[PDB]
Design a protein around this ligand. Structure first.
Ligand SMILES: [Cl-]
Ligand SMILES: [Cl-]
Ligand SMILES: [Cl-]
Ligand SMILES: [Cl-]
Ligand SMILES: [Cl-]
Ligand SMILES: [Cl-]
Ligand SMILES: [Cl-]
Ligand code: NA
Length: 129
């Protein structure tokens, strides 16, 4: 599924991400824009053989099981395929564990490089939330 901007903001609020760990909804929408372009089915292979999955590009090195990332963990206790669903529940639940892990949203390098410090409220501007 490819979300629209306000459609995703709404879905993220419905699943409890707005102001989770103090990160406003525009932070989460901005991270999703630059990680996946709002596409739930996005996959990207990393140099090290891990893969990033879904709207928030969650990495198989730590968070999900894809059966092909040697020496990796599955701390969200989910198959990485669950992170590709039209329903963002699995991605949100897992993202809550990642953002609680100690470095906040810096875990998302695209959020650090493209969203952190910017006017992230623009991402929810005009949305009926
Ligand atoms: Cl957009
Ligand atoms: Cl915001
Ligand atoms: Cl594996
Ligand atoms: Cl594990
Ligand atoms: Cl699995
Ligand atoms: Cl959803
Ligand atoms: Cl923080
Ligand atoms: Na893994």
């Amino acid at each position: 599924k490819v979300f629209g901007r306000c459609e995703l903001a709404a879905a993220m609020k419905r699943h409890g991400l707005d102001n989770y760990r103090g990160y406003s909804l525009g932070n989460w929408v901005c991270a999703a824009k630059f990680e996946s372009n709002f596409n739930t089915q996005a996959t990207n292979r990393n140099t090290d053989g891990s893969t990033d999955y879904g709207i928030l590009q969650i990495n198989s090195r730590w968070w999900c099981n894809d059966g092909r990332t040697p020496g990796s963990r599955n701390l969200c206790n989910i198959p990485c395929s669950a992170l590709l669903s039209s329903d963002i529940t699995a991605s949100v639940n897992c993202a809550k564990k990642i953002v609680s892990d100690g470095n906040g949203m810096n875990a998302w390098v695209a959020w650090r490089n493209r969203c952190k410090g910017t006017d992230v409220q623009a991402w929810i501007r005009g949305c009926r939330l």
